Amino acid sequence: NAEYLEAKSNALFLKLRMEELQVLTDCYTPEKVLVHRQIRDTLEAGVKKE
Amino acid sequence: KLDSHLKELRDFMYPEGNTLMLTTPELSGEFHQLGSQLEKLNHITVEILG
Amino acid sequence: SKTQRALQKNTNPDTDALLKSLSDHYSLELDEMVPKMQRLIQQCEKHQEYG
């Protein structure tokens, strides 16, 4: 009973972590990462000037 | 001697006097609590996947 | 002599040895199994926060 509850806990957590990482890959495509870099560099230049 | 051995073994097997103790009460509580927490984690996992 | 022969047939395990085995088993569940379950409870709670 202890081993079964441990295995079920671990399987539920790994399923949750897998779906999070799949959303992150769907979010951050190479084209968007390039745009996010341009936005970052424009913001950092603004923060430094101010 | 027979009366003493019977009494000592009975008191160990029936600590509340009326129920045969098969599982350690502390462990039985932890099984119920882990069961409940795992049912909550399963609900959160199903909701996010939905 | 009938009673002593009946005691000798029933004596594997001896009552003191059985009480000791029962006490050792009770201690093993408290020291190893209970704190394993409590760690699994705390891990489940962290996994609910990670949700």
Curated annotation (Swiss-Prot), chain B:
<comment type="similarity">
    <text>Belongs to the HAUS3 family.</text>
</comment>
<comment type="subunit">
    <text>Component of the HAUS augmin-like complex. The complex interacts with the gamma-tubulin ring complex and this interaction is required for spindle assembly.</text>
</comment>
<comment type="function">
    <text>Contributes to mitotic spindle assembly, maintenance of centrosome integrity and completion of cytokinesis as part of the HAUS augmin-like complex.</text>
</comment>
<protein>
    <recommendedName>
        <fullName>HAUS augmin-like complex subunit 3</fullName>
    </recommendedName>
</protein>
